[model samples]
Target chain A: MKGYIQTVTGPVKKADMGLTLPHEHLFNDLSGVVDEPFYEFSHVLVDKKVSADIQWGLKYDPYCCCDNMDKKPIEDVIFELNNFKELGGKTIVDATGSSSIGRDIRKLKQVAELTGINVVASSGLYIEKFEGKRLADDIDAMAKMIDDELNIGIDGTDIRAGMIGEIGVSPFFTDGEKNSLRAAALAQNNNPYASMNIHMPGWQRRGDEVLDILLTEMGCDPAKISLAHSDPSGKDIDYQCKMLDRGVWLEFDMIGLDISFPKEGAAPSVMDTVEAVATLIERGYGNQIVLSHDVFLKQMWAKNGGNGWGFVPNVFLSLLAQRGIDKTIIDKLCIDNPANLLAAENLYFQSHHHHHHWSHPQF
Target chain B: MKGYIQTVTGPVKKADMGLTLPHEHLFNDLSGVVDEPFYEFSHVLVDKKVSADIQWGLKYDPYCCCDNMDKKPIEDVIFELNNFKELGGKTIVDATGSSSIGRDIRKLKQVAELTGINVVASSGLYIEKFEGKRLADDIDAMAKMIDDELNIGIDGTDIRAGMIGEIGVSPFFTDGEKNSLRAAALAQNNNPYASMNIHMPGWQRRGDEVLDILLTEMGCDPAKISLAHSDPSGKDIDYQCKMLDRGVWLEFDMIGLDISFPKEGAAPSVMDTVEAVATLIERGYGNQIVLSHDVFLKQMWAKNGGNGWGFVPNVFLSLLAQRGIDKTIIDKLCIDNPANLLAAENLYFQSHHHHHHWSHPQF
Candidate 1:
């Protein structure tokens, strides 16, 4: 292997990775998601009773319950991940970034060691609403934190992050969100060994504008950017082609999540997204696609009546095969793309060393 | 004693209280003070060397170094308290509210237990710049945290707070600052036994507007409010009388802090402020005065070429006597006023149980 992927345990050869889930949360606290104003809709209505009625409302409104986003035991995640290993899954990227957003990297390390699963941790902020202006206002500090987490360690621990984000952005790039993305871009420009993942604005279609900020404004490499929550935008081949033309990964990560609130047809079905991926493959953009289950909530856990970590390998692969998508394209989506993105390289470091001293006050 | 003041250790009789400093920080992390934009004035130029040149510049801009705001050893704080105790100082309110602003209640408890100094801890956010929006946005949550800190404990510890602020407000009440003050008012209205202390907008003369938000809008009891950092505003006897007429105590806590930048005459001199206090007493507002050193930084420590916690009792009190001010009025400023404000009363709870269900969405 010419390049190795940094895991929570340590670095491993990229060839060692088998079937990989590019985005997954082993342990996280999204209870702060309730801090979002839209979560108030369910807050005034839904009761926290573990009933069929409450669970039904929660399908569309999971952000209402703090307990739903609270930390789950490492044992439960390990057990589910073991099932993932049995399904031939090799690695999982914990998209949870920063302890403020409930990122417990030590727990991820524990799970990685216990289950023998390669856990690639994230190093960036979530959103302005979640992270605030602590690092957001200071782009240098924010980039330094991301850079430090990748090179040195996170929160004074020796365990480093292998990726830059799921760096969250909103529709109207708040100073906090914009600065975080700017910092992510700076870090990604400096560390091409590790790719950057983006959590796009949940409501609006600002994918093009987000690309502008990352690629045009901040000089981020399109090849190293992973745009997540694309299931919503994944339906449009033109939108998919517009993004793929720029060379970024369109991560259709909500493989098993279908929501019914904010509207009856809020999110596309799993097969509907599978058809989009199949179309993209047919149009010769297979290498720029990635898929995963962005699982952060307990309701999405198998123990809580939802698809677990094995959904992508065990279920979605079968869906792709049935959709007449080639196994090579499937492998590109599942393993090769992710491994390439996660692999550490010497050239990226040498080339981007100049960007390390970028002194734009606007950042 | 019919009323008892809550110490970090436990409740003590208000009558048992003697000389007190109503506003002081025992342990805090004002490193966030660098987050304020004005600190950049010194950040670009000042070297961290402990030299006369840098020390002179730091007199004007002390927020440049993060280490200056970092926590001191508990033994050091304990040693400082013993000096105040030697000056007949019985109580010291650790106005370092909320751990985000460097409040360490457990350390305050240790100081109280070891030195036998009645340590009254505070329960509120500092400023929007320092604390962000963790508690500031949600009045109910912010009030609950403050009320819980006063009634239950702080940071999952059993050391309860006796007072409800130095709740920080900026010139233009940023949504975060305004809501924190609103929350402070709600908490104060609910817990009149624990008076609220305020940190006014450092630059602007918005003391009137702050009072408007707390008293006119939020229905906070005027009698239970202690306005801190009044040395800047204490020059205006009309301003002092206007606030005093509203039944609030004016706290002149920055007794020894004479800064030279932002301009050469930025802060009022110690004796000049003492003269202001003398005039307030002469005009019959003696019952509504409180004094403290407001010591936070290491540079302000006795070992660091500056006055320490005893600056108020040892130095400022002597100046007040030198001005031929009555000792009884000095006792009211140093001892009796703080004891009355710290005392817990039963009637306050019975009167404010109605306000517990306030349903203002604007908060």
Candidate 2:
């Protein structure tokens, strides 16, 4: 399967493009549900704990008003989308696919309704424990889900999904990972309009092994796939060089949480991501990289004592600008690549056709 | 207070007498009993995870029969200590102090009975977290505990504990570590027969902080206190020379665990220890150096999913012998120096003890 370039959602124009969302999420919850069922009233406090444990949820806390925006009104989402525009963010791929926690396409479309930002969403079963035993057994079913989401749109509509990930391995991956990989392959094989983004595992040399298996055994085209979270792998330099040498997009998506594990040493911060991209540029492989904060799920912040602090999409743009990254390269990742990936598919569906508009929601 | 040497257990005479016990566990994990109930378990499984998380009961999993002989029969410990005797392990200071984990006097006595390995138990608390809330409230209580352990023997016993460490600052320590230092000073003030074994945190300039604090603030005699674990602390040639110049015993413990923590880089292994000792000998500070394994917890094979393995104490002696280290010098680190440290209290402990019944245990 060739590596398809897909942007689920964001603004379309080159002028509007600044930085690409290589892997951003609308929401995510590792644990199936909140521990407290009636957490709506004191959701802020309850959600903070969830956010702390889950990465994406932690990214929206403190200021995104994530607690108040649960099942957020469509108008509010449009307002949130507009904020991206104000920050010069033209394109963003909602890498939060069907498998993650708290993902809602209805809410996603609402945001799209408000803001004309080209928003892209993915398709696949997530690596959650409670998703049932046989959910991973039927690769055909998983592929159909990705196919339908790409062609027919999510939940039976014409609002076609744009990407096939961020997929791939997890820390505690089981056979489900292989099924997910198969599903991603099928999506790429069936839908040339959608690209696959893979989330690599954190263990030693696991990312390289996964890539090898995907490209060699599974017949995945290196150029069509984006391997996310390249920073913490520790083998990033070698792995990135290896994958890019084979034409894969090396994505350093987790931009902010560098100080989370200070004792273990710094994680790839926004600057680190920029530096990585800059290195690739210097190495003459500038086009084979993507960047974004895979922010999703309010519960992520709740897990870490509920003090809301997380990275937003605009952080990447700001970091790139500060680091003197070329705006054209940023546009290639955020707009051109995504537009090219999606332009192959002419699926169109309009929600709130003219009801709402997008504005940046402060986080 | 003058640094006096006293050996709790082990043999006395060998070809040479300049041995060091860098990785001995003195008196770890007893303060908990003063506030809580004693939890007993036998057999510890040493793994990287268990090593990483040094929590209370969860820290040492003594269920595996592979490593810890103390967890087995009392006779086993005796057999092990006798083996040390055969290897010419004349005077080994018990680095396992009361504050680490599972420090039992009965176990110490049992170890003494089984084998003639000179055991020296430590007094002061281990790290801050291991100490309970009132570490600051009663310096006198801490002092009294040390006093009783040293002068009157621990818990109203006749076996007077020898040595004041392996003590000193941890890398994560703040002003909170000062209390342990004060208690150590008090113990030294009363027990003139007891020497202090200060454990330096890591290699880096911060190690000098510990040396300065121990000598200046605590008033510990440089000739008496052996600074342990200096090898991994980033001790360059200049650093070792300077420390030796200061008259402090430069201990190169953890010579065996060089294979662990790959991020730590190439450490001064057993070869380095021998060279350092030789250099110290040439510089006329041979009497001030000691050698040890710091092999506190045994390897946990089950935790690394059964991949983790480790070396035993004999490996050090074999390496020293193989590296062309003079038998006399080896005897000094493994026997003479330690015996001298043990003999500082009275020369009679050296002469009066009969060596006829002492048969070397098989290595």
What candidate 2 gets wrong by more than 4 Å, as runs, is A1-18, A29-83, A128-130, A134-137, A171-173, A207-209, A212-214, A217-220, A234-236, A258-279, A297-363, B1-363
Among all candidates shown, the one with the greatest lDDT: 1
Give candidate 1's error at residue B68 in angstroms.
68
Q: After superposition, how far is residue B187 of candidate 1 from its true place, in Å?
A: 73
The positional error of residue B274 in candidate 1, measured at the CA in angstroms, is 72
Where in model 1 is the C-alpha error above 4 Å? A35-54, A261-265, A344-355, A358-363, B1-363
User: How many steric clashes between backbone atoms does each model show?
Assistant: 1, 104
Q: So what's the TM-score on candidate 1?
A: 0.47
CA-RMSD of model 1: 23.9
Scored by CA lDDT, what does every candidate get? 0.73, 0.52
Give all TM-scores, in the order shown: 0.47, 0.43
How many times do residue backbones clash in model 2? 104
Candidate 2 chain B has its poorest 10 consecutive residues by lDDT at B301-310
Cα lDDT of model 2 by residue, A8-123, tens digit: 34324433444445566654434433344221222333444322222212221222233522543345335444545664665667776764455567666656655655677778
Model 1, range B1-363, lDDT digits (tens) per residue?
A: 267778998888888888888898899876655533233235532336432223333554566655565677897788667767876788989888877777888888888889889999998887766676574467888887888888888889888999988888766568788888888887877764778889885445677888899888877667678888888877777777988998787888887664433332356666568789888888888888888788887666654434567667755665677677888787677778877766746333434453455444547
